[PDB]
Amino acid sequence: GSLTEDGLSYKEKFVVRSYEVGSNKTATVETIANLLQEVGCNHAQSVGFSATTTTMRKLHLIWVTARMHIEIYKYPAWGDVVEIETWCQSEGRIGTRRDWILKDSVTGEVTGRATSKWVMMNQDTRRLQKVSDDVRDEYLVFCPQEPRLAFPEENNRSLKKIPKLEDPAQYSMIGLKPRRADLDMNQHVNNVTYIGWVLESIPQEIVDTHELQVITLDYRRECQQDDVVDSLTTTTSNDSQFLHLLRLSGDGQEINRGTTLWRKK
Amino acid sequence: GSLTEDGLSYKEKFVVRSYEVGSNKTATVETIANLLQEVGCNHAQSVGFSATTTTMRKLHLIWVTARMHIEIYKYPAWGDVVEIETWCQSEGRIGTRRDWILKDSVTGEVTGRATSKWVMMNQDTRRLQKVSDDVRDEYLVFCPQEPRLAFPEENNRSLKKIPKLEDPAQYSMIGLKPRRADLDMNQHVNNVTYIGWVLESIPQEIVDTHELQVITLDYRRECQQDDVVDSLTTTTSDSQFLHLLRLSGDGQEINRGTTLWRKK
Ligand SMILES: Fc1cccnc1N[C@H]1CCCOCC1
Ligand SMILES: Fc1cccnc1N[C@H]1CCCOCC1
């Protein structure tokens, strides 16, 4: 992988692995999400991070995902080479945004796109906060100054408000728990695990006859290593749409909410 | 990746990813196991198995893992390049064996080694069988003829008999279930998931103060997508553990194993 010529974006190529694919011999949405995370991390590293700035480490602040939005046109097959370009942009004092473009390395065609919203939070108290000028000036030199959006369209799905699923849910998958493979290097549940948990309450027949085109996920609260999660889904819809809710098994505390759009094969 | 000069083994390099590492910023044993599986699949593809041969497909036969043995001296760090060499060998009528050698690409030193036993099975009835000479001759042209062992030493850990853990277990993790990410392209639970499940009953304090040096796992029966598993561990000792994976309900054995851990 490498930063582009202007140093304002990063590209990396990946060869799709045997264990990374599902029944159609194409990459699952969780493999795609893992690759987006890996290219994001390689971009932060190439521009001097170890992505907390100098001022952020001093003040015990971190970037946390508030929303993830992915749209896939074609999932790459086992052994195929996918090229992913990523970049960041400041969204004023609200936080930051990281976008991605997925391309087939052989044809050069766009096969997918993603966008994410990140908010600043104190690592210890979990208290959200706005972005100060001191922090903003430190990461602006690594961002394109003019807007560059993976989802430019005026009324696109990435900025839609997601409602809270009402009980009773049409479908459910109960008692989901993270294992050590689900944790990141800091012992927190990896953000991609939540995507997997949301998808667990979709019936196998839908997965067997449809392809996931779009997923939008809001991150409200994190699941601890010793927490248990319930995954809830209700059909809201040639295309099928679903409303999703992840909540703690006991008290029913919301951890995530989301929507998926699926097209018939 | 590519076959070596003689075409009797395969090498591939991997750059360790951010999500592939644990708390020490080094690859977990499950990442290592995934890489061994990937290089194994790439070897089979390079020699024409787009690893079932022509005769196996007609007779509805597949290779299934009976045992996996891994020894790690150094886990590669996040961003490091690891080189893995793999090869296969016939073990007469019993089945086949696949071995691996892990090396640090920069230093060239051996950082790990692995060996696995595979048995022939009818994919529909799940009935084990011996290897026929028709099948044996079809894969012998892809194997070194003289023995080449990742674990040569006489009386070594890879061939030790593993006993069945007796109730009550010292430690346990119950109600483990596979999710879709745990399944392979054929909708079966990936072999690496069982390694993860075995490790779930090891206490976090042991994981926080020790490094896993050796793991031996016997595969008795598969866990279906709708099955629930209980993971059981007892200290037998460096720290050694005896492991048992069984179905949550009837208590049917799926795996048994042992782990050896060194203090950091
Ligand atoms: F770029 C990242 C660096 C570190 C962590 N996550 C990143 N990106 C997203 C991965 C895909 C699923 O959504 C969550 C976040
Ligand atoms: F070479 C392989 C091809 C396909 C599947 N597994 C392979 N190898 C081992 C993977 C890691 C531990 O489980 C034992 C088998």
Curated annotation (Swiss-Prot), chain B:
The active site is at N186, H188, C223. It is found in: Plastid, Chloroplast. GO terms for biological process: fatty acid biosynthetic process. This is Oleoyl-acyl carrier protein thioesterase 1, chloroplastic. Plays an essential role in chain termination during de novo fatty acid synthesis. Possesses high thioesterase activity for oleoyl-ACP versus other acyl-ACPs. Substrate preference is 18:1 > 18:0 > 16:1. It comes from Arabidopsis thaliana. The chain holds residues 75 to 359 of 362 of the full protein. GO terms for molecular function: fatty acyl-[ACP] hydrolase activity. GO terms for cellular component: chloroplast. Keywords: Chloroplast, Fatty acid biosynthesis, Fatty acid metabolism, Hydrolase, Lipid biosynthesis, Lipid metabolism, Plastid, Transit peptide. It catalyses: (9Z)-octadecenoyl-[ACP] + H2O = (9Z)-octadecenoate + holo-[ACP] + H(+). The keyword RNA-binding does not apply. The keyword Hydrolase applies. Its EC number is 3.1.2.14. Its main location: plastid. Belongs to the acyl-ACP thioesterase family.
